[PDB]
Amino acid sequence: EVQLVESGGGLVQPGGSLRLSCAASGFTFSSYAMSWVRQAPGKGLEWVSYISSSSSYTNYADSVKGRFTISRDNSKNTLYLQMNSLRAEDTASYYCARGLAGVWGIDVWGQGTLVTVSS
Amino acid sequence: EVQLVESGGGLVQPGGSLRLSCAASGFTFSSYAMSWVRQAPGKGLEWVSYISSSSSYTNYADSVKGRFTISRDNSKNTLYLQMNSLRAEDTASYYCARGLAGVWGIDVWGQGTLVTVSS
Amino acid sequence: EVQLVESGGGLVQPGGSLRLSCAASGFTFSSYAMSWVRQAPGKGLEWVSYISSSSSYTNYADSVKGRFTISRDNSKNTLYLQMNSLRAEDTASYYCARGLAGVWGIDVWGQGTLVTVSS
Amino acid sequence: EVQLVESGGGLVQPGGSLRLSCAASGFTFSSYAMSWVRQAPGKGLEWVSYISSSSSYTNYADSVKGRFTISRDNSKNTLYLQMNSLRAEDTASYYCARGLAGVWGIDVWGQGTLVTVSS
Amino acid sequence: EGVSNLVGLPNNICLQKTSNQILKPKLISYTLPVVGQSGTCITDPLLAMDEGYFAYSHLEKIGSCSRGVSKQRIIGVGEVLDRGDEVPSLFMTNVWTPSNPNTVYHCSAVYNNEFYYVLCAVSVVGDPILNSTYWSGSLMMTRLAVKPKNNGESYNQHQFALRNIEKGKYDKVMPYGPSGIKQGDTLYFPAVGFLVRTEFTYNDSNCPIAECQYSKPENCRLSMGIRPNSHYILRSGLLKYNLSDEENSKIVFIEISDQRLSIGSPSKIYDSLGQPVFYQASFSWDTMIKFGDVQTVNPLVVNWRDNTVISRPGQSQCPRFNKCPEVCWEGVYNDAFLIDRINWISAGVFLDSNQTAENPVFTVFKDNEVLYRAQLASEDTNAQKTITNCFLLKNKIWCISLVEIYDTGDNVIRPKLFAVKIPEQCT
Ligand SMILES: *[C@@H]1O[C@H](CO)[C@@H](O[C@@H]2O[C@H](CO)[C@@H](O[C@@H]3O[C@H](CO[C@H]4O[C@H](CO[C@H]5O[C@H](CO)[C@@H](O)[C@H](O)[C@@H]5O)[C@@H](O)[C@H](O)[C@@H]4O)[C@@H](O)[C@H](O[C@H]4O[C@H](CO)[C@@H](O)[C@H](O)[C@@H]4O)[C@@H]3O)[C@H](O)[C@H]2NC(C)=O)[C@H](O)[C@H]1NC(C)=O
């Protein structure tokens, strides 16, 4: 059974710097793909960051092309996201999965992590 | 290339309170001038609010001297305008630029934002 | 009972512009002295501004001689402070009292206002 | 909830002099034990300095027996460490806890403080 | 107010079997992140507690957790105080580490007036319970104070090696167990004896093979050793050390009685509620727990407690709940500390598995039934050795148990110490 434990921070002042984390267990993390997926209440899926297996390819969206950069920690199973210079349009719950955006995902989204950017 | 993303809608009751926003990218926002310019179908340019770089000077027009007050958010590139106590004569499309009224303009007006005050 | 109500806020970018306010009630504000006093955790009293009753004399410190200028609003009891061009060494809690720096103060310091300049 | 706030500095020349600080709140500091613990990336725990409650016993390690001396300031809850004559083998993150080296520690390590001695 | 042992009259504890989990496991071994993972492994634990002072020992192995190497053996003592409001913990004050890590094995701790002797075994051939046919037999006792002073040099660490041994018929002695007892000025250490198999006097007709059709009669004799064709049969016992003389180090191995005579296993004796209580692990034909109180201190005679609900797991050869003689040297160490004598109430972390070593669960049982259990972890975390010790906190019984578990974000067997409070009120 694949368990995805989302983490990170929230309820921060707009324009700060948050660091979202997501550890995993089970499947071999040394060669696989990870992606952060967020969704605002009312909207659907929205992909922001993608990381390859050997950390050779990192894709980003048009709205977050220069906001944050995803990394990889293949030594210790985790998934960091150093969110920098966020706005009010980033108030959503972020999720980690095994697909860039798609409609795919071969594991139940465990808990997620809500990031509130307001006031 | 300078991109101006106007935001904020209309369709408000006479005497309501709307908040128009306009973000930007490219040029350094820490030291520059921002101004809201509106134009109704049939008329020409009409300046409403002006502000300096250090937020030390805020100019307004004779018709909107007490309607709204322009602010500055040099931390996060944007341009807010808390429109308060509007009338039917304020039904026009608002624009953000780098000139008070003039006939000037140093960037193509991207989309604008139409505000309708009627019924 | 003299009540001092500090206001303002912190958490600003280095080199920004903040405006601290402090209203009061009780004693006659039309003829008295007001001064801003700050103190960082680890240090003691450190005055930054001074003003007379008729706004005829305005004293400042050597470190904030050209940073901000204290004003007076004898019509509506308040005490403004337009802090401009602050640095990381200005992270402290500001207070309003009835003495320049001294060790004096004839009223309990109510709440104060912490100003943070970092990141 | 016991909160440990590590402080100090870093990025010093080989053979300099740094002063690490660590304040605490909660548990009664007048009678308890404090110890600095460091760990380099790749290695494990490494105790350097220990001190008792009444400042009657001060123990040090074989490698830092004459480098620094831990003190105690029970009046003001803190933990100082005047690191003197450090080398390149002292580049690690220092932590304060309530156990000499052990595998013990009865509180979550809050933030720590990294010390870099190179170039 | 003070942290003492089980003396006087404590508060009334739960005396009924309840399924409602009234046990509150509290962790006091909060470790730091393990960024920079490697093949670390922590084994060979030790936890003794007496009159508010504790001790600890461990051998960190880089690689495999069984057939690994030695890098450091942190042996240290300390004091027992409270974290906050009614939250006791272990505060270490002194730490000692030997120069060569691959020399010290099978330590044994004991309490004293203002010191803490650590009797360890010295070997140059590795594990003495695996290469005893070439072991010299030298023993070393390290004395560590629970309160060091400035510039003592003779009051903080005392590296002492013993000289004379009073071995009567045994060929070698070795401290084997967590801790022992003391009576004024006479320290006792748990140990195991090495005796020749050809020099054993045991008639092969007292073996419980009557109601054991699937058990050969010679299984009792073949189970007294590590292997059938071995050269030594283990024998449990205690080491006597009279420190009131100090003229010559005396080592007297007092063998255990013949009642339910099993193979040598890590034993633990402790003075609970005045009377000394003895424990002995089960690495032999008998898989049930060996518990009981001691009536004769020096001539060790333990009245074995016939519990039929608490045992330890094993391999396919000798699994849990096996009461017939079978040639097998396997098991796991799981002790228990006595918390009541009027009703004979015990408490300890015993594993709950048939042929595996997972799901460490703290259980309380008087004589033949489990009162209330509580899982210290999930049902998939492995566990090998558990050490349970109980004390008092100024009005009530508290128990701290060292349970080696498998942490999620550490990938290494970590000896997590859980602090459990004996419930006074239950449902
Ligand atoms: C239980 O305890 C017993 C006793 O305590 C242990 O038995 C002991 O084993 C050791 C071996 O570890 C014996 O020591 C000597 O080992 C020498 C090995 O030399 C090298 O061996 C490794 C292999 O590398 C070499 O391989 C070949 C081998 O021929 C060479 O040609 C090649 O060039 C390499 O050099 C190297 O990695 C290592 O570093 C060594 O350098 C032996 O050469 C030596 O033999 C002497 O002694 C013999 C009598 O025992 C004698 O007949 C020979 O002629 C020669 O003089 C010796 O074996 C201990 O002697 C031995 N003790 C006893 C009492 O016999 C046992 O291992 C242990 N078991 C466990 C499980 O712990």
Ligand SMILES: *[C@@H]1O[C@H](CO)[C@@H](O[C@@H]2O[C@H](CO)[C@@H](O[C@@H]3O[C@H](CO[C@H]4O[C@H](CO)[C@@H](O)[C@H](O)[C@@H]4O)[C@@H](O)[C@H](O[C@H]4O[C@H](CO)[C@@H](O)[C@H](O)[C@@H]4O)[C@@H]3O)[C@H](O)[C@H]2NC(C)=O)[C@H](O)[C@H]1NC(C)=O
């Ligand atoms: C180690 O353990 C073994 C096994 O228990 C012991 O050997 C047994 O000893 C008992 C005695 O306690 C034996 O029981 C009986 O032995 C009788 C011996 O007969 C002679 O006895 C004395 C000498 O001792 C003579 O003076 C006397 O005149 C007899 O001539 C047997 O006659 C008995 O037989 C009965 O039982 C058998 C079944 O076994 C029936 O078939 C018979 O009809 C009769 O009813 C009885 O057996 C026992 O036999 C011994 N077993 C074995 C295998 O030898 C060892 O003594 C013990 N050693 C030590 C040092 O502890």
Ligand SMILES: *[C@@H]1O[C@H](CO)[C@@H](O[C@@H]2O[C@H](CO)[C@@H](O[C@@H]3O[C@H](CO[C@H]4O[C@H](CO[C@H]5O[C@H](CO)[C@@H](O)[C@H](O)[C@@H]5O)[C@@H](O)[C@H](O)[C@@H]4O)[C@@H](O)[C@H](O)[C@@H]3O)[C@H](O)[C@H]2NC(C)=O)[C@H](O)[C@H]1NC(C)=O
């Ligand atoms: C560990 O090692 C220590 C030693 O380091 C052991 O402690 C010793 O224990 C023995 C017990 O037998 C002590 O021997 C005692 O000696 C006493 C002598 O003191 C005075 O005796 C006379 C009094 O008249 C006695 O007459 C007879 C003699 O047997 C007695 O039966 C009577 O009751 C009277 O007491 C005096 O005239 C004389 O001048 C002496 O002052 C003796 O009285 C005791 O009966 C007993 O024999 C020995 O002294 C202890 N040693 C020390 C240093 O304290 C300890 O037991 C060991 N622990 C073990 C083995 O577990």
Ligand SMILES: *[C@@H]1O[C@H](CO)[C@@H](O[C@@H]2O[C@H](CO)[C@@H](O[C@@H]3O[C@H](CO[C@H]4O[C@H](CO)[C@@H](O)[C@H](O)[C@@H]4O)[C@@H](O)[C@H](O)[C@@H]3O)[C@H](O)[C@H]2NC(C)=O)[C@H](O)[C@H]1NC(C)=O
């Ligand atoms: C297993 O055993 C447990 C033993 O502690 C049981 O817990 C006890 O359960 C009983 C029955 O529910 C409680 O008795 C009642 O408690 C309520 C709530 O107490 C709270 O009151 C205020 C809020 O009003 C709050 O601030 C306090 O801190 C209390 O938490 C009372 O209102 C009732 O009058 C009555 O006393 C016990 O209080 C409770 N023990 C504790 C320590 O709280 C548990 O219920 C058992 N579980 C099962 C399934 O049997």
Ligand SMILES: *[C@@H]1O[C@H](CO)[C@@H](O[C@@H]2O[C@H](CO)[C@@H](O[C@@H]3O[C@H](CO[C@H]4O[C@H](CO)[C@@H](O)[C@H](O)[C@@H]4O)[C@@H](O)[C@H](O)[C@@H]3O)[C@H](O)[C@H]2NC(C)=O)[C@H](O)[C@H]1NC(C)=O
């Ligand atoms: C953990 O260990 C426990 C104890 O070792 C295990 O319990 C034992 O399970 C075995 C299973 O083989 C039992 O052994 C046999 O049980 C069956 C009973 O089933 C039949 O019963 C009657 C005949 O009595 C028959 O008419 C029915 O139709 C059934 O088919 C019989 O073959 C024998 O009687 C024999 O005893 C043990 O009896 C049982 N022991 C106890 C004390 O219950 C447990 O299963 C283990 N669990 C795991 C997960 O490994």
